[PDB]
Design a protein around this ligand. Structure first.
Ligand code: CLA
Ligand code: CLA
Ligand code: CLA
Ligand code: CLA
Ligand code: CLA
Ligand code: CLA
Ligand SMILES: CC1=C(C#C/C(C)=C/C=C/C(C)=C/C=C/C=C(C)/C=C/C=C(\C)C#CC2=C(C)C[C@@H](O)CC2(C)C)C(C)(C)C[C@H](O)C1
Ligand SMILES: CC1=C(C#C/C(C)=C/C=C/C(C)=C/C=C/C=C(C)/C=C/C=C(\C)C#CC2=C(C)C[C@@H](O)CC2(C)C)C(C)(C)C[C@H](O)C1
Ligand SMILES: CC1=C(C#C/C(C)=C/C=C/C(C)=C/C=C/C=C(C)/C=C/C=C(\C)C#CC2=C(C)C[C@@H](O)CC2(C)C)C(C)(C)C[C@H](O)C1
Ligand SMILES: CC1=C(C#C/C(C)=C/C=C/C(C)=C/C=C/C=C(C)/C=C/C=C(\C)C#CC2=C(C)C[C@@H](O)CC2(C)C)C(C)(C)C[C@H](O)C1
Ligand SMILES: CC1=C(C#C/C(C)=C/C=C/C(C)=C/C=C/C=C(C)/C=C/C=C(C)/C=C/C2=C(C)CCCC2(C)C)C(C)(C)C[C@H](O)C1
Ligand SMILES: CC1=C(C#C/C(C)=C/C=C/C(C)=C/C=C/C=C(C)/C=C/C=C(C)/C=C/C2=C(C)CCCC2(C)C)C(C)(C)C[C@H](O)C1
Lengths: 170, 192, 49
């Protein structure tokens, strides 16, 4: 009837509540206009990118590899777009994303679940109950990391202080 | 409706001897029956009250706003803005960005909360116009406490909109901020 | 399985096959994901929602 996340608003219809982390939050209502599975895949992929980015932002600040020079995370993109590595990374991401396109075509026909790629190399969430809890934890942590990566980078621009530094001295 | 037929409602008439508008029946709160220029016929009383309520809310924030901003400038803001109030403060604030951040966040609230809610209400929805559910303090459990409350939100809010105006208009023609304006009663001795 | 296996073939012609492979750049399957909700788009989307 009414979304718990937004009580004054009514519950978005396509957001029945089956997907993990679904609190009926779709104020503009993209789910009503597009397939929810495609949006879920986009959410999971962007969020996984953001989780890795948020971790790497700090890991670079504490430790930059010795063979590479020491640059704050944001200053590095410009470095490696020339060093060569930048190309290698973006090259491999495209390579994996071609099979991502194939998986998206499977998703359109309903032969694959959104944000699912059977990656449990070490069988972490092989329990039905846990895989649920993990799916909920995954979507939350992804939703948080989306904010965190943007903050990290935008703070550097407004204040030349790798987060760890800035936090140390405001 | 708090005191229906007494303070609000059909029997009451702001312009007695003039018929209560055709579309102004009992249910809407704050209906003393005053739509002299007959907007009721052309406008959706739903949008109408979304507006009235919204305005009165931003107007209360705003009135108190000006009154407090003239007693206790937050010190950090104060130092940046140099004791400038109302009109000019907006101009200087708009520079520090205070007013720019406020614009972004209130607009984000609107695009997330306001816009969607109105679309639903006008289509038709359970939600009353202006009925965001906001009471963390679920301050009035009673429906009755809540009727008195809605009437009071509309009306305290109308004094609000009339007064924000007074504050601002007075400030344009005479320098003083509202706390300042009452003091220095005449206000024409010094255009300040 | 079956050691040497030759799979009888009666599918599209070689010319048609290379046209399919050309279709990867001419009409890839990427953007079709973002076409509108194809079952009914909520053609009966209730006004309240
Ligand atoms: C999310 C995307 C992302 C992006 C765009 C980059 C980009 C970059 N990282 Mg990496 N990094 C990432 C994730 C990412 N990182 C993660 C998850 C970690 C934690 C292990 C790190 C830890 C890390 C370190 C310690 C260093 C870099 C550095 C670099 C630069 C060269 C690549 C390299 O040596 O990677 C190596 C990273 C990995 C093999 C880990 C990633 C593995 C997952 C599966 C992806 C480049 C600017 C170097 C740099 O800034 O030099 C100036 C550098 O010293 N990164
Ligand atoms: C959201 C992140 C982001 C953004 C906004 C851009 C933006 C841009 N990239 Mg890319 N880039 C990214 C991530 C990103 N890149 C990552 C994760 C990598 C892997 C290291 C690269 C590697 C890369 C290379 C190698 C190059 C770019 C280039 C460009 C350009 C444009 C400004 C090109 C550039 O700087 O020239 C225009 C370029 O040559 N990027
Ligand atoms: C802590 C965050 C977190 C959590 C709770 C999960 C949870 C999950 N991921 Mg994983 N995932 C993560 C981070 C996380 N992921 C990151 C950073 C990436 C990008 C590299 C991915 C990329 C990814 C893919 C591509 C896939 C999964 C899958 C899954 C599901 C099955 C695998 C599993 O058991 O993972 C459990 C995860 C953990 C116990 C977290 C490990 C914590 C370390 C220390 C960090 C499960 C719901 C698979 C899936 O969708 O199956 C349904 C799948 O195909 N994940
Ligand atoms: C329409 C609403 C409105 C608007 C447009 C503004 C605008 C402004 N206020 Mg604010 N203000 C408001 C309501 C409003 N106020 C209300 C209701 C109060 C009473 C608590 C205040 C009390 C207040 C003070 C004490 C100060 C400002 C200041 C300012 C300026 C910088 C922003 C700031 O510090 O916000 C801070 C505002 C708040 C913390 C109040 C939040 C109220 C909501 C409802 C919660 C800017 C011109 C600063 C300035 O530069 O003054 C010289 C400043 O020192 N305002
Ligand atoms: C910047 C973004 C933004 C957006 C998207 C909207 C959107 C809207 N506003 Mg506005 N509004 C904004 C900022 C914004 N407002 C701000 C900053 C204020 C003052 C704090 C107001 C005060 C305001 C009032 C008082 C009213 C609107 C109303 C409206 C509606 C018609 C216009 C719509 C929902 C009208 C409405 O919703 O009632 C019909 C209305 O009466 N707005
Ligand atoms: C003294 C004036 C006053 C009064 C009597 C009320 C009365 C009420 N407000 Mg409140 N309200 C006020 C000022 C007031 N409000 C102001 C200045 C604001 C702007 C910050 C709000 C913002 C506000 C919201 C967002 C909501 C209420 C709601 C309510 C209701 C529950 C409490 C009640 C009718 C709730 C409501 O509308 O429930 C029907 C609700 O969700 N009020
Ligand atoms: C309100 C609202 C909504 C909403 C919403 C919101 C809030 C949406 C927000 C979305 C956000 C915040 C998305 C962020 C994505 C970030 C990514 C992919 C980062 C990638 C980083 C990479 C590849 C990198 C890197 C790098 C790193 C780390 C190391 C460096 O050395 C190098 C480099 C710089 C290259 C919903 C959803 C309901 C809809 C509703 O109707 C309206
Ligand atoms: C091993 C394994 C797997 C795996 C895996 C992997 C690689 C998992 C990796 C997971 C990672 C790296 C997750 C990172 C999450 C980070 C978050 C939520 C950060 C939030 C930060 C915030 C809010 C902040 C902030 C801040 C901001 C913005 C500004 C600052 O001034 C202040 C502050 C610092 C407070 C899988 C599951 C795939 C399967 C396999 O079978 C087993
Ligand atoms: C009623 C209602 C609505 C509404 C509304 C209204 C009118 C809302 C008004 C809200 C107000 C007045 C909000 C004020 C927020 C101030 C903040 C967060 C200050 C931050 C200061 C900072 C970070 C600082 C600083 C500093 C820095 C960095 C540098 C230092 O040298 C100085 C200093 C110390 C000052 C809407 C329109 C949405 C409609 C809806 O139907 C309901
Ligand atoms: C809803 C809700 C809650 C709440 C709440 C909130 C946020 C309540 C906020 C209420 C506010 C801000 C009320 C403000 C009213 C202001 C008025 C009527 C101004 C009148 C001005 C006049 C007469 C004037 C004037 C003047 C003029 C023109 C010129 C000047 O020179 C002189 C002078 C000053 C005389 C909480 C969470 C607490 C509980 C609940 O669970 C949910
Ligand atoms: C430009 C560029 C680059 C780049 C780059 C990169 C990597 C840029 C990345 C940017 C990102 C990830 C930005 C994220 C912004 C997030 C926002 C505003 C979220 C707001 C959420 C809110 C307010 C939530 C609100 C909320 C909601 C809805 C629900 C709950 C309540 C509440 C919390 C209030 C380089 C460095 C590679 C260099 C290159 O030469 C060019
Ligand atoms: C911020 C900013 C600015 C600004 C500004 C602002 C904040 C402007 C605000 C303007 C407002 C709030 C004006 C209100 C006017 C109200 C009037 C005339 C009401 C009359 C009511 C009557 C006659 C009622 C009569 C009645 C009574 C009593 C009895 C009952 C019948 C009834 C008819 C209802 C600028 C422009 C200076 C620019 C600057 O760079 C930035």
């Amino acid at each position: 009837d009414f979304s718990a996340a937004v009580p004054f608003l009514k519950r978005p219809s396509n957001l029945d509540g089956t997907l993990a982390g679904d609190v009926g939050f779709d104020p503009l209502g993209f789910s009503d206009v597009f397939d929810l599975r495609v949006l879920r895949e986009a959410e999971l992929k962007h969020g996984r990118f953001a989780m890795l980015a948020v971790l790497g932002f700090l890991v670079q600040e504490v430790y930059t590899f010795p063979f590479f020079p020491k640059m704050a995370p944001v200053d590095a993109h410009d470095y490696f777009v020339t060093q060569g590595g930048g190309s290698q990374i973006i090259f491999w991401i495209s390579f994996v994303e071609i099979f991502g396109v194939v998986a998206l075509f499977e998703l359109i026909q309903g032969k694959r679940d959104a944000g699912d790629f059977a990656f449990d190399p070490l069988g972490l969430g092989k329990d039905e109950a846990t895989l649920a809890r993990y799916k909920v934890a995954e979507i939350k942590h992804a939703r948080l990391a989306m904010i965190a990566i943007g903050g990290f980078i935008h703070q550097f621009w407004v204040t030349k202080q790798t987060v760890l530094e800035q936090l140390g001295n405001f | 409706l708090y005191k229906d037929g007494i303070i609000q409602g059909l029997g009451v008439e702001a312009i007695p001897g003039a018929g209560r508008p055709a579309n102004l029946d009992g249910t809407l709160v704050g209906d003393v029956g005053f739509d002299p220029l007959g907007f009721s016929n052309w406008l959706d009383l739903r949008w109408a009250r979304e507006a009235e309520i919204k305005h009165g809310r931003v107007a209360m924030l705003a009135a108190t706003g000006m009154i407090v901003q003239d007693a206790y400038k937050f010190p950090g803001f104060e130092g940046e803005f140099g004791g400038a109030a109302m009109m000019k403060l907006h101009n200087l604030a708009v520079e520090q960005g205070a007013m720019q951040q406020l614009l972004l966040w209130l607009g984000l609230l609107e695009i997330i909360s306001g816009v969607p809610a109105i679309i639903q209400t006008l289509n038709g929805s359970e939600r009353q116009p202006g009925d965001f559910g906001f009471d963390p303090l679920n301050c009035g459990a009673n429906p009755d406490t809540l009727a008195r409350r809605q009437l009071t939100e509309l009306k305290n809010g109308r004094l609000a909109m009339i007064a924000v105006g007074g504050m601002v208009h007075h400030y344009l023609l005479v320098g003083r901020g509202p706390i300042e304006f009452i003091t220095n009663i005449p206000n024409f001795k010094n255009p300040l | 399985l079956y050691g040497k296996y030759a799979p009888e073939y009666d599918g599209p012609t070689f010319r048609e096959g290379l046209e399919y492979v050309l279709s990867f750049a001419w009409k890839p399957p990427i953007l079709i994901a973002w076409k509108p909700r194809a079952d009914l788009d909520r053609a009966m989307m209730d006004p309240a929602r």
